């Protein structure tokens, strides 16, 4: 019996096309360019979710550093003091305190100078 393509290929192409909604010109319009665009995007996404973890940590650090230097020390000194104090509050949080709770950040800074 014969098994002509029939419905199947239209159906794969739409799947891809639908994922490509939003892309520029032929990239959302032509299955071929869609797919090409999509390979790139799966990789960036993968790569970039890896690096979001870095992107944020670098941010927290810049903030913590700014807050430290209001209290006359730098990030490297502050971190070492915390290490020595045994304080394990992570940077996501150090950074939130630095902005939302300055009295608390100050005490931590204190603990950090003292700890050395």
């Amino acid at each position: 019996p014969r098994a002509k393509t029939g419905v199947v290929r239209r159906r794969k192409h739409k799947k891809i096309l639908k994922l490509a909604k939003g892309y520029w010109g032929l990239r959302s319009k032509s299955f071929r360019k869609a797919r090409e665009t999509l390979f790139a995007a799966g990789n960036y996404a993968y790569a970039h979710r890896k690096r979001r973890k870095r992107d944020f940590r670098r941010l927290w650090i810049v903030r913590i550093n700014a807050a430290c230097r209001q209290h006359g020390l730098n990030y490297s000194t502050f971190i070492h003091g915390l290490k020595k104090a045994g304080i394990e509050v992570d940077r996501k949080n150090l950074a939130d305190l630095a902005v939302r709770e300055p009295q608390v950040f100050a005490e931590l800074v204190e603990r950090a100078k003292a700890a050395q």
Binding site: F39, A40, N43, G86, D96, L97
Partner: protein
């Protein structure tokens, strides 16, 4: 009065009344669980070294679920290497009940 708790290899700032998704806890929906406290702030400040002896945050587990699917795709040019995986990370939903300082 807020607390910095540590659950799931991560730390969160919690206040009573807060709903929070964290990595999946092995605890029946409706149970209540006690989180470690790394720091208390608000009115009084107490600073764990690393955790504070007496404190706990009491959380009720509203449920466990699965995150919206992420497509993790791998592609290498010129090698016909292509892989497509759907990922849904399990999580637990907690309601923060009290901070037992």
């Amino acid at each position: 009065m807020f607390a910095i708790v540590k659950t799931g290899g991560k730390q969160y700032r919690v206040e009573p009344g807060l709903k929070l998704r964290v990595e999946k806890l092995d605890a029946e929906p409706g149970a209540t669980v006690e989180l470690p406290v790394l720091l208390l702030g608000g009115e009084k400040t107490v600073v764990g070294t690393p955790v504070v002896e007496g404190a706990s945050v009491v959380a009720e587990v509203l449920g466990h679920g699965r995150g919206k699917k992420i497509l993790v795709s791998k592609f290498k040019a010129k090698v016909q290497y292509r892989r497509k995986k759907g990922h849904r990370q399990p999580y637990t939903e907690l309601l923060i009940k009290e901070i037992r300082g």
